[PDB]
Structure formats: C-alpha cells, structure tokens
Design a binder for these strands. Structure first.
Ligand SMILES: [Mg+2]
Ligand SMILES: [Mg+2]
Ligand SMILES: [Mg+2]
Ligand SMILES: [Mg+2]
Ligand SMILES: [Mg+2]
Ligand SMILES: [Zn+2]
Ligand SMILES: [Zn+2]
Ligand SMILES: [Zn+2]
Ligand SMILES: [Zn+2]
Ligand SMILES: [Zn+2]
Ligand SMILES: [Zn+2]
Lengths: 100, 143, 141, 206, 312, 121, 222, 67
RNA sequence: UAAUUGCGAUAACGAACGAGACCUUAACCUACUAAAUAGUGGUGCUAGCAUUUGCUGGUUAUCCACUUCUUAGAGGGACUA
C-alpha cells in the first residue's frame, strides 16, 4: 500500500511521543514498517545587531529555530490508514501522510 | 597480474597518454589553438603551445575513467582557478567551456568516451581498454 | 565467511574507513596502491604503520581504505590512523592478545595519534574580529 | 636482510627502512651527539623520525617544546614572515633540500651539522632592561638552555631568510651555508655575529 | 603445607572484579575487570610469567562486575554495570546472547550446573532467571535492598530432588530460594552491615556470607541454622571454599585471610609486597578463586593485576 | 519450488517427528524439541542420566555429562579428586618429587603422568 | 507547495500576528494568551483570558465576529477556522494579566504605589515564589525615574529564567507622557507539573529509615 | 580552579551524616547510591557531590573530621 | 579560588540576589533503537586488464544481509580518578 508519514515539528518530545505511539500502534496491528528515520536537524539562524539604532559596541546576536524531521514507512490496508491519519493529533507537530 | 589507470601515478600516466595521442595524430585539434587562454581567470595562454590539447585530452579521459559520468560544467569547475582581480581579492573562476566541450567531442570521435544516460560523458569500453593498455606500457617503461 | 574487520581513522574533518580482511598483502587507498599517496613528502607518514611492525604482519591480510573530508594532510593522517587501528583490530579478533599488545605497544611508543584520535577541534569565531581570538583594530582618535 | 613480497609491491629502499628509522630515509639519528652538556636534554635527537612533519602538541605545557624533535623545530621556524605562515609542506621540502646540500658540501652527517650550529650559536649571556631612574639601563643576565636553543634557531632561520630575500640563491642553499658557517663558528654567519654582539653588549653592561 | 607467591598476570587497566576457573580446562582462567573487558588466560605453571592472555572479550559498555565459566569452559557469562548480561564463546570471543531486562546495574551472574539456566542478581533489587536463548523465564522479588551476589548450591547427590540458589544483598539479610517453583525457603538473619559476598561449599551444606563489618558468618542450610562467625577485623570482598580441603579464603582489605576449619584457625594470612603505595594505602584483593584441584589461588587486586599463590 | 518430491519420510533420530510423503525437494526436517533418544534411555558410561537436551542430529556432538566425581590422579598420591564426569585430567596437585636418576635433584612436575618424569634438570 | 523552513516560519509569524491582534483588542477582557492547534479539516484557536463572558458576548456574538475577522484577514475557508474561549487558571501567575490590570488602574487614576502594591500582594497571595513590578517614567515630576516594588525572591540568570520567570511589559499613555510597566513573576517550581520540579542547585536527601540492631543470628523457614 | 561550592560541600556532609555505613570509599559505588538516595537535578552535580563524598570518606578513614 | 570560591576565624545568627549550578554547542561510544532521502558487504547483470581463483569499475527494483563509517532519539562517560 506504501504509505509514508512525515513529522516535521520543532518540539522534540512531542515529536518523539507521536512517533512512539504510531510505531507501537503499528506493531500492535502487526504491520511491517521501516522504523522512524530521523533526518538531520535543520537549524535556522538569524544574526542581527542588538541595538535598534547604531551606536555602542558592535554586539551581534544569533537566534535559531530548530526543525526536527522524521518519517515512517508503513505497509498497511486502507482502514488502518484512515484510523492512523485520524489518530495522533498533537499541537505543534506537523504530520502529513502520502501514498505510493 | 593486470593493471589499470589507478595503479599508475597521475602525472606520468597523463604525460604518456598525451604523447601517445599526439603521435597517433587523429584527435582533431580545433584550430583556435594558440589563440586562447583556457580560462577567463588566466592571463597568459598555455606555454606548451604545440601541445596542451593532448594534455587536456589525456587529463579529461583519465578523469572520466575514474568517475561515473562528467559534463562540461564539472570540467569547467575542475580546470578553473584563482583569478587575480587586480586590486580586489582573488576568487575562483571557471575555465573555458568551448575547450572542454570540444575536447569531449574529440574524445567521442576517437571513441574514448560516449554520451551517458543521466547526462554527461562516460568512458566507453574501447576507451577503457586503451587507457588500460597505456597504463600497462607506462608501468613497464621503468623495467 | 572471510575473516574481516572495519575500522576508521580521523583528523579534523577527514575520515578514513579501512576494511582489513584475510588476503595476500595488498594495501589500497581510494582504489590505488599505498605507494601513490598524494603528498610524496608525506608518503612516509602512511608508510610508518607498515614499517614500525614489519611487512610480515601485512603479508597475510589485505587492507582497503576510503578517505573523505578534510584536506590533503589531514587525509594522510586519517589514512595512517585507520590502517594502524585496522591491524590492531584484526589481531584482536582473529589473532591472540600477545600479538595485539605488542602491536599496540609499538604504535603507542612511536606515535599516540596512530591509534588515538587527536582531540583538537576548531574554536568558533566570535563577532567583532576575524577569528576566534583576534579582534578588529581599535583606534582612539 | 631479506625482502618480503606483498600483493601491493613495496620498493626496496622503504623496505630497508624497516631496520632503522632515518630522516627522509637517508640520515641516521644514531651517532649524533650534542657537544654542549648544557644543551643536552634540550636538543632532542634521541627519537628518530622519518619526516619532519609531526602534528604534535608541544604548546600546552611549559617545556614540551624541548621534547619536540629539533629538526621539526627548525622546520617550524622556517614558516615565517606572513606570506609563508602555514606552509609546512614547503618548509619540510626546504629542510630536506638543505640537509642534502649540507651533506654534499661537507661529508658530515647533516643532523650533526644542525646540532653543532645550534650549540655554537646559542647566546650564553644576555641583558635585560631595568628601571634605572627614568633612563633605560641594561643589566647583564644569564641565559637558560631552552632560551639558548630557541634563540639559536631564530637567529639561524632569520639570517637565512634575510640572505635569501632578493637573491638568486634559494632559501635551502642560504640555510645550508648559514648552518655550515655556524657549525664551524666561522664568523661569516649571521647567527654567529649576532651571538657575539649580544655577548659583547652584556659584557659591557655588567 | 603453606601458600607461596608464584607469579602475576598483567593484562588489565582496571580493578580485576572477578575470576573464574573450569574443571574441564585446568589451564584456563577467566577474569572480568573494571576496564569493560574480560580476559581469558592460558596458564603455564612456570616462573614469574605463569600465564599469558589469549583472548580479550569486549562489548560491555561499563564496568563488568563478574563472570562465570561453564564446566567444559566453552561458554562464559559476564554481568556488567551496563544493565545487561552477555554469553561469550571462549574460543572466538563472539557474543552468542545478550540478556536484557534488568533496570539497574547487574552485579552477579551464575550459570547452573548442566547449563540449563542462568541467574542474575542486580541493583534494582531483583534476581532474574533466564533461559540460554535469552528470555527471562522468571524474576524474584522481595529482597529489600540491592542484591550483591547470587550463587547456585551444588547438589552432592547427582540431581537428587531440586536445585536451589542463595543470594546476599545490602539489607543485612541472606536468602535461599528453591527455583523449581520460584519460592523462598530459607531466610538467614544475623548480619549487621552490607553483605558483599557469599559462597556455598562443594559439599552443598556450608554457606559463608560476609561483608563490610568483617564478620564471616557460617550457615548450615542442610539443617537451616546458623553455626558461628569468624572475624577478619576489616572489610572483606570475596570468599571461596577450597574444592578439596576444608579451607575458606577471604579477600580482606589488608590481606587475604585463609582459614582451615578442622581446628578453626588462621593458617597463612598472606600479604604481598608492592614497593610503593605506602603513603596512602596498599592495593587489596577484590576477587579470588581456587583452581579445580585446589592447589593455586588466584586473586585479582585493585592495582589491575592478578596474583597467584601455590600451596606446598 | 522444485518439481521433484522425495517419496521417503524424513525421520529424526527420536522418530517422533516425520515429514509425510511426498516431501518437496530441499525440505528441511525440524529436529524434535523432545529430548534425545539416548537421554530418554538414560544410558551413559558415567551411569548418570545425560543432561536433558533437545534432540539433535547424530553427527552433531552430544552435550557431555557433567557430574563432580572423584577420580585418582596421574600421580595418584590422591585416590579421589573432584572433577566433572567428562574430564579425564584429574589433579592431586602435588609434585611427584621423585629423585631424578641423572641428577641429584628431584622432579617437581606435579601429578606426573606415570613414566613421564622430567628429562632435564 | 512550500518548504518546511518557510512553512514553520510562516506559522510562527501567523501566531505572532494573531497574538498581537488579540492583545490589541481584548485588553479589557484580561487576555492572557493564545494557542493554535492545526487539525485535519480544522484549525482551532484557544484564547486564554479571564472574562470569558465578555470575550463571548451574547450567544458568542463577539466570538463569531472574531472568527470572521481572523477568517477575512488570513483567507481561511468557511468552517476551517474555529475560536474557543477558556478561563485561565492562576490569574495571579500571569504577568500579562497583571500588567494589563496595572495599566488600567493607572489609567483610571490610581496612585502608582497603591496599584503596584496591590498587584504584588495579589501575585504573592496567588502562590508565587516572587513578584517584581517596575514603573518607569515621569512620576510627579518632569525628570523621569524608575520605581521598583518587590516581594519574595526572584532569580535572574540561567535556564531557570526561561523555566520559571514570566515577564510582561506595557506602555501606559498618561497625559504627560508614557509610563512603562514591567512585571516579573517567579512561580513556585514545585507546582510546575510540566518539566523540572525544582531549581538546579536544590538537593534533597531522603531520610534513612532506622532499624533496630538484631544482635542474634536466626533462620526463617518455609 | 577546582574549589567546590557550598551546595556540593553541604550535600556531601549531609549524605555522610545520615548514610555513613551504607556508602564506601569508591567513587563508582558512591555515585550509584547517591543518585538513588538523593534527588539531584544534574548528572554533573551528582558526580561532584559523590566525588566530594568519597574524598571526605578518605578523610574520615584517616582520623575524625571536624563538622 | 576564575570567583564574598571556599577552609576557617568571629557581636553576630539565619537568609536573598549575583558567581557557581543551569542551558546550547564541540570532542568519545565497533554498547541500544533504526534507516531505498546515510552508507557498507555479498549475490544477480555487466566493462576493462590479467589468468585457475585475481584487480579496478558500472548498474539499486536485482535481491539479500549488516550498522563500522553517517544521521538522530534514549542513555553511558569525568568526579580533577
Ligand atoms: Mg589548475
Ligand atoms: Mg593572497
Ligand atoms: Mg584565523
Ligand atoms: Mg632571492
Ligand atoms: Mg554490484
Ligand atoms: Zn527427535
Ligand atoms: Zn544427543
Ligand atoms: Zn555423569
Ligand atoms: Zn597428582
Ligand atoms: Zn617425576
Ligand atoms: Zn639437577
């Protein structure tokens, strides 16, 4: 059936618990799966001058937002596919499911 | 025991194969040779005037032998160098595309390389066999 | 199957992965023999793992190294570390502990970086200067 | 000796290197003695190396540079005046050529010539600035052996670099006659003249 | 007869935490150490060398706390502070089985005779018993502080009725379990400090348990009654019965006190010489093991060596 | 799957488990989890029962018996020494110490195999 | 069809703009924050405020007009966006709510010390570990100055600042100029229930249970 | 410098005061009992406390310690 | 002591902020969980050079196996032992 679930949050613990209950639901349903592949964490950096005007010591400041991405490959029939996409809703965790 | 291009040092292999191609004399040297510089980042033409095209040909043939498939843009980046921009800092500059494209076409016409799927030029089986034979000769020359 | 081990050596960003298996004595780096490693002023730096213990240790095994990352000299250092660690790991797994300890002792007595990676890492650059420590020129008038 | 055959063939000279470690596979570290009993334990020639390039950490502690091999210390001091900062491959090539030229010009061991140059041109007394009541006075002091080795290397390489600048002679040649003249104490050496001048100034300022 | 120092074995760079020997192979010695490794040694019975390492076993990611050998010596077991047990092929290194399930540091492992099954006492106050293939067939609870050692009691008769194990923890309480049905049967009270070690006699009737207070307490579990206590006057870390004689060796913090039991007196009380360590403290034996014939006593110390003693 | 089929049932040494004909070519008989026929008999030279082990192929070595038995040593200064049933090397652990003929000194090798006293002193 | 970097930055700026809009219009309703939950076919916006009846209005009329406002501005389809109101707990432990209440007291005409001591007493009574309110500006004189009012203990450096201190800043538009209100509240780490229950340097030794010495060897049997 | 602060020193003294016979002169076992017998928020702080505790046990073994 | 960091002394005792702790990052893990968006080995198919068997490559739907190298999650590790 070849579905892939991609999770792309910034919250590591919510991401990991979403991955964990998806994979334990899959092994409970005895579905063959490729495990959660964890992509490299992508760090979004913005470096700015601290001052609103332009005087004083030239102090700089780097802000960063970390994006954590995982994906799970599943071979499961369509009814469990809809039940999976209807369960595991978490705030701040972006989930998408694609087929073939 | 069998040899390959990887068993021979790069410089003397390239010199031997360039001399072989010059002695064979069917590479179709383009004609604007002795006019051009080989790079926008260069300032003088190649000093080995009557050669240097056989040198570039042996170099790109060995490069394609080692790789999977190589194109003209990869070749331009490979042979480009640091340009002296006068009073401003130095910078990497790609080499001339016409020279590399014409030497790729010349190697195709003599049968060393061929058009590859997934683009670029890959070495042909005839190119593999005669580059290997040149490697055998240049490793035997020291005996 | 064939007895074999895999090891690695490191220096800065250069990593060399060595497959040491039972064989007849070929030492290859990036598919080319060990005698063609690029800075020939530094060729003895990858010769010295072979030379300190003798080539009779390498007669019955063959080693293939792939090195990536870093630059020229750091790749040379990673190659020598991967080769020495591969020989020690092979003598650990398939030969006895006396031979392993003698190899380790010889390598350690010559150069600790033959087996233990150099831990020096780049310091991050800080704002207000071109480097980690150096600052822009200060003027007063 | 018997050669051993490998699937990747190894040349006969580097197979010879299995018996003894020699600098650039040519110069034996054995039978090299430091003539000065003060500068032994600070000139390191007991541990052989094949190449004068060891990525070693001698800067963390106060006296590890004494355990650094002396050929690599000369090599390190060659990498100077800004344009040559870094470039240890160029420095080791220059050192290799220098040792070859030394052995050609005199049939001695070039490592022995290098250690004789260092022992001969270490300055044995120096002077230091004092307060002196608003005017600079200089008071003669003694020199520690580590400083003698350091300053000998600096004088030798600075003399070679200055005499190679704007000259048809190469840096390896200039370092070769610099080390040869310092090993003889011939007073045509920059380092010998500088050492003599410093000792004379200190003797005046006792 | 008297014990005399014969030689030392040097392959470790951590505390030699345990020693094991085999009847099947009288020239094999297995030592587990604090450097995350095991070493199998071949003994030679000669001058100062006396033995060489023939294999290192690596793969434990923390301190390996103890080790046992099977009777044939082909299989070895290791318990380590990485909360796992490992079964090794003594010939080729080669971990066959990893036993997981303990939640804290596993401190003791013991195969039973007949290689039927494995007991392991850990720091999560449990004694887990396992199959060879690696499944936890049962777990034993009710032991209120963390377990220091577990041992199996050797049957004098050839498999008379059942198999029993003994255990000591840090709750000043030693226990004896019948694990044919996974119950506790004997519960020996009487210790006043953390019990470090316990040993069952080859006869199967004597239990010696001892710890930090220095009181080596003897028990007759055939009648299930306490008999008496010996005093070492200092902390003792390992105990072992001689397989032929009526001797009990104790690795105290100052020496190794060995006692014969037929007059109940101290016979030798060996102390090695170190040439150093005099300012703070001499290294002391933390493990010891007799040979199968009871002629050589091996002792692993805290200066990362193993010293041997031969009886005359 | 291969067309050829064996007409003969595959039989384990116990014989409890068989593969019914026709048997597809290359089918692998599964050995009985039931004990070895020899274990069921209980026959052994030691006189004990072999360790109860699952059935295996005869070519595969049988697990040996391991009972602490007391056997006389090579020197034999001691009649009974505790050893496992399989082991044939029993050790009194006591040097024979028999005055060598050729030397003033004795032979210290312990548990000397009879007739094996040291040749050089 | 957007990259993940741009999508996550875009919904971050959507959250920031929505929070600014809600704090601009719901200031007199005790608006204490907002939370966004994306869901297949629906995204829900949870407003956390104190006066939920004023946020809702009659039959949720203000809720309907706020949904229509955020819908019209952010181009959502009908039914895809839904707003809920929720009464926040521990109102004393909300720096934004306390700062807004102080702002409205100062606008109504309360004295600065009376308003600041009222807010610090309310926050300390609500179970905070510490409170600190700063009022800056032209106070009774043309020359500006700053007044500080504290109670309890507050920490200033390290990761516990992100863990435990909540801060808020407000601009009060008085007829002589702007006053600045800064409110910092350090909550009790023990009542957290999400994350660390203590400060990093707090060490708790458990009391050993004492047992009587036995002085007699005995065997229990089964 | 390696001077240990009063949180480490006070925790070590309290641990020794109420757990002296349980804990030993070995850092590894002292660490393994300190993490379960006390609630310390950092592995680093637990290691520092267990190390100073082991140091004080050596001091106690060499005669009594004031405080 | 880097540190009002501590040992202590002591008309002060007990505390609070700062320092430290903390958090992020860089170094180690042939130990765990895995990976056709990371790799490696082998088997298919195939090229060249050799000649028993070898060497260097190409081709992922050609499949299998593994996780050393790579990426994370969870942990371990240093506490001046
Ligand atoms: Mg170029
Ligand atoms: Mg430049
Ligand atoms: Mg720089
Ligand atoms: Mg010049
Ligand atoms: Mg292939
Ligand atoms: Zn059967
Ligand atoms: Zn059988
Ligand atoms: Zn038997
Ligand atoms: Zn005997
Ligand atoms: Zn004899
Ligand atoms: Zn004799």
């Amino acid at each position: 059936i070849k579905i892939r679930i991609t999770l792309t949050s910034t919250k590591v613990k919510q991401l990991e618990n979403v991955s964990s209950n998806i994979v334990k639901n899959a092994e409970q349903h005895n579905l063959v799966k490729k495990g959660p592949v964890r992509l490299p964490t992508k760090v979004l950096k913005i470096s700015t001058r601290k001052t609103p005007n332009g005087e004083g010591s030239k102090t700089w400041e780097t802000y960063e937002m970390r994006i954590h991405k995982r994906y799970i490959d599943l071979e499961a029939p369509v009814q469990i596919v809809k039940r999976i996409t209807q369960i595991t809703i978490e705030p701040g965790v972006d989930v998408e499911v694609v087929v073939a | 025991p069998g040899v390959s291009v990887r068993d021979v040092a790069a410089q003397d292999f390239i010199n031997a194969y360039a001399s072989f191609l010059q002695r064979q004399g069917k590479l179709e040297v383009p004609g604007y040779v002795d006019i051009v510089k080989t790079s926008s980042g260069n300032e003088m033409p190649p000093q080995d005037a009557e050669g240097w095209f056989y040198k570039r040909a042996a170099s790109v043939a060995r490069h394609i032998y080692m790789r999977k498939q190589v194109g003209v843009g990869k070749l331009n980046k490979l042979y480009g160098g640091a340009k002296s921009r006068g009073v401003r800092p130095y910078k990497h500059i790609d080499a001339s595309g016409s020279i590399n494209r014409k030497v790729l076409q010349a190697l195709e016409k003599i049968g060393i390389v061929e058009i590859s799927p997934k683009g670029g030029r890959r070495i042909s089986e005839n190119g593999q066999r005669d580059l290997d034979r040149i490697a055998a000769q240049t490793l035997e020359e020291d005996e | 199957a064939v007895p074999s081990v895999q090891t690695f050596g490191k220096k800065k960003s250069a990593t060399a992965v060595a497959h040491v298996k039972a064989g007849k004595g070929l030492i290859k780096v990036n598919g080319s023999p060990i005698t063609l490693v690029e800075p020939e002023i530094l060729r003895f730096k990858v010769y010295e793992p072979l030379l300190l213990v003798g080539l009779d240790k390498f007669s019955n095994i063959d080693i293939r190294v792939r090195v990536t990352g870093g630059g020229h000299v750091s790749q040379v250092y990673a190659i020598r570390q991967a080769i020495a660690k591969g020989l020690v790991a092979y003598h650990q797994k398939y030969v006895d502990e006396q031979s392993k300890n003698e190899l380790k002792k010889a390598f350690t007595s010559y150069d600790r970086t033959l087996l233990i990676a150099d831990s020096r890492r780049p310091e991050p650059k800080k704002f207000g200067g071109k480097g980690a420590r150096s600052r822009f020129q200060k003027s007063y008038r | 000796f018997t050669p051993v055959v490998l699937a990747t063939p190894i040349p006969e000279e580097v197979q010879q290197a299995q018996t003894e470690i020699k600098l650039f596979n040519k110069w034996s570290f054995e039978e090299v003695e430091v003539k000065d009993a003060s500068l032994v334990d600070y000139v390191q020639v007991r541990q052989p190396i094949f190449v004068a390039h060891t990525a070693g950490r001698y800067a963390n502690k106060r006296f590890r540079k004494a355990q650094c091999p002396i050929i690599e210390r000369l090599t390190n001091s060659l990498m100077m005046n800004g344009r040559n900062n870094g470039k240890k491959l160029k420095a080791v090539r220059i050192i290799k050529h220098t040792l070859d030229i030394i052995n050609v010009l005199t049939d001695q061991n070039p490592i022995q010539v290098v250690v004789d140059a260092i022992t001969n041109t270490g300055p044995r007394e120096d002077t230091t600035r004092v307060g002196g009541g608003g005017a600079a006075r200089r008071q003669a002091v003694d020199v520690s052996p580590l400083r003698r080795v350091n300053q000998a290397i600096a004088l030798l390489t600075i003399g070679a670099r200055e005499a190679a600048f704007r000259n048809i002679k190469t840096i390896a040649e200039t370092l070769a006659e610099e080390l040869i003249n310092a090993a003889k104490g011939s007073s045509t050496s920059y380092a010998i003249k500088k050492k003599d001048e410093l000792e004379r100034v200190a003797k005046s300022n006792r | 007869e008297v014990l005399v120092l014969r030689g030392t074995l040097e392959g470790h760079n951590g505390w030699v935490t345990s020693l094991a020997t085999s009847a099947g192979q009288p020239n094999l010695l297995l030592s587990a150490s604090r450097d995350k490794t095991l070493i199998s040694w071949k003994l030679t019975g000669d001058d100062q060398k006396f033995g060489v390492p023939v294999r290192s076993f690596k793969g434990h990611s923390h301190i390996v706390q103890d080790c046992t050998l099977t009777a044939d010596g082909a299989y070895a077991l290791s318990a380590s502070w990485d909360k796992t047990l490992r079964l090794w092929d003594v010939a080729t290194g080669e971990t066959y089985q990893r036993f997981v399930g303990h939640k804290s540091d596993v401190m003791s492992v013991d195969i039973d005779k007949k290689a039927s099954m494995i007991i392991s006492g850990s720091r999560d106050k449990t004694i887990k018993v396992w199959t060879i293939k690696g499944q936890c067939l049962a777990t034993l609870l009710g032991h209120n502080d963390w377990v220091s050692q577990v041992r199996v009691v050797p049957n004098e008769k050839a498999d008379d009725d059942s198999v029993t194990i003994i255990s000591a923890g840090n709750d000043k309480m030693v226990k004896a379990w019948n694990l044919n049905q996974f119950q506790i049967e004997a519960d020996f009270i009487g210790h006043n400090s953390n019990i470090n070690t316990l040993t069952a006699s080859p006869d199967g009737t004597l239990i010696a348990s001892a710890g930090k207070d220095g009181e080596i307490m003897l028990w007759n579990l055939a009648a299930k009654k306490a008999m008496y206590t010996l005093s070492a006057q200092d902390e003792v870390f390992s105990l072992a019965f001689s397989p032929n004689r009526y001797w009990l060796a104790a690795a105290t913090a100052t020496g190794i006190k060995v006692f014969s039991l037929d007059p109940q007196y101290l016979v030798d009380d060996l102390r090695p010489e170190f040439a150093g360590y005099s300012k703070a403290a001499e290294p002391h034996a933390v493990s010891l093991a007799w040979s199968a014939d009871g002629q050589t006593l091996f002792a692993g110390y805290t200066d990362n060596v193993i010293r041997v003693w031969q009886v005359m | 799957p291969c067309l050829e089929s064996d007409s003969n049932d595959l039989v384990c040494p116990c014989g409890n488990t068989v593969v019914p004909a026709p048997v597809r070519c290359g089918t692998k008989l599964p050995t009985c989890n039931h004990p070895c026929i020899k274990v069921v008999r209980g026959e052994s030279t030691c006189g004990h029962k072999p360790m109860p082990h699952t059935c295996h192929s005869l070519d595969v070595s049988c697990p040996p018996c391991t009972e602490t038995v007391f056997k006389p040593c090579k020197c034999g200064k001691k009649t009974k020494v505790r050893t496992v049933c399989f082991q044939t090397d029993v050790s009194c652990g006591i040097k024979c110490g028999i005055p060598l003929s050729y030397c003033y000194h004795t032979c210290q090798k312990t548990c000397h195999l009879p007739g094996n006293c040291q040749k050089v002193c | 069809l957007i990259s993940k970097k741009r999508k996550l930055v875009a919904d971050g700026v959507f959250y920031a703009e929505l929070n600014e809009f809600f704090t601009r219009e719901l200031a007199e309703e005790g608006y204490s924050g907002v939370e966004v939950r994306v869901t297949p076919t629906k995204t829900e916006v949870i407003i956390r405020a104190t006066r939920t009846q004023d946020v809702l209005g009659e039959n949720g009329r203000r809720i309907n007009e706020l949904t229509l406002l955020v819908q019209k501005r952010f181009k959502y389809a009908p039914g895809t966006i839904v707003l809920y109101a929720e009464r926040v707990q521990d109102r004393g432990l909300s720096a934004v709510a306390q700062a807004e209440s102080m702002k409205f007291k100062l606008l109504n005409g309360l004295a600065i010390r009376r308003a600041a001591y009222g807010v610090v007493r309310y926050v300390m009574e609500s179970g905070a570990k510490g409170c600190e309110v700063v009022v800056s500006g032209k106070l009774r004189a043309a020359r500006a100055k700053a007044m500080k009012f504290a109670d309890g203990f507050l920490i200033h450096s390290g990761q516990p600042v992100n863990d435990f201190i909540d801060t808020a800043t407000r601009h009060v538009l008085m007829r002589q100029g702007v006053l600045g209100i800064k409110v910092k509240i350090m909550r009790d780490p023990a009542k957290s229930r999400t994350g660390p229950k203590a400060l990093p340097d707090a060490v708790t030794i458990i009391e050993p249970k004492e047992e009587e010495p036995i002085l007699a060897p005995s065997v229990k049997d089964y | 410098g390696r001077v240990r602060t009063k949180t480490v020193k006070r925790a070590s003294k309290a641990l020794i005061e109420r757990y002296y016979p349980k804990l030993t002169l070995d850092f590894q076992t002292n660490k393994r009992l300190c993490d379960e017998i006390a609630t310390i928020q950092s592995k680093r702080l637990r290691n520092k406390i267990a190390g100073y505790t082991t140091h004080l046990m050596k001091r106690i073994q060499k005669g009594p310690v004031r405080g």
